[PDB]
Structure 1
Amino acid sequence: FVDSTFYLLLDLITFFDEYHSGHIDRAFDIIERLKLVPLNQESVEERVAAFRNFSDEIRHNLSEVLLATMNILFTQFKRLKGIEDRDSQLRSQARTLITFAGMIPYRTSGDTNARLVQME
């Protein structure tokens, strides 16, 4: 258990290194790997069920996990210029993430200013 949290913290850190310094695409891939945040469907709630269970160390970290996601998600999905462009994904991801954030704002520091980054 102790080691597991350890690796998670390291993974999150590598995500940080690559978050900024560009590499928007890479950040999503890694964050998803964490298996902390709902990329799939409305499984956002399962992410609720598995949230309280979370160890104290991680439970604290989630705030940044979200908003990192809505950032890369934003910047990467800068509306492009002028073909296959599936904007839909990396869009659904924000949606699931927001539902997630919506469900646990009380158990979070109190910055659903995801909204600012969310829109434009």
Structure 2
Amino acid sequence: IIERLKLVPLNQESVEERVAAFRNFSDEIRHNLSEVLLATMNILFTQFKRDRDSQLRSQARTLITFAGMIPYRTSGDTNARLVQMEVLMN
């Protein structure tokens, strides 16, 4: 589902356009960006413990760079947790 919405980038090429879109999306959406990134990360996180490894690793990176360039709710705690979950993958 999250992949269809094209709200969070998963390939590095889409980061530029997805980042620009966030600027004009309703604040009722930007509010919940924090929980979306974490759920999506925790989703990739779970699928990793179950090539494919490279693909998840690449997508993991994408979420981080997006979150890094986006100023949003609880960006502090969220950006940190996102990075930790990516380290455990490797």
TM-score bin (small chain): 0.7 to 0.9
Query: Which protein is bigger by CA-based radius of gyration?
Result: 1
Partner of 2:47: 76
Percentage of identical aligned residues: 100
| Preserved CA contact (<8 Å) 1:37 1:97 | yes
TM-score normalised per structure 1: 0.59
Offset of residue 31 of structure 1: 1.1
Runs ≥4 residues deviating over 3 A: 105-110, 113-120
TM-superposed CA distance for 1:119, in Å, is 3.6
Distance 1:97 1:33 in 2: 15
CA distance in 1, matches of 2:80, 2:45: 11
From the two aligned structures, give the one with the greater helix fraction: 2
User: CA shift at 1:63, angstroms?
Assistant: 0.9
- For 2:16, the equivalent position in structure 1 comes to 45
RMSD: 2.5
**1:59 alignment partner in structure 2:** 30
Number of residue pairs matched?
Answer: 86
Residue matched to 2:62 = 96
Using CA pairs below 8 Å that are at least 6 residues apart, which structure has the higher relative contact order?
2
Are the counterparts in 2 of residues 63 and 109 from structure 1 also a CA contact under 8 Å? yes
Q: Which moved more, 1:34-43 or 1:95-104?
A: 34-43
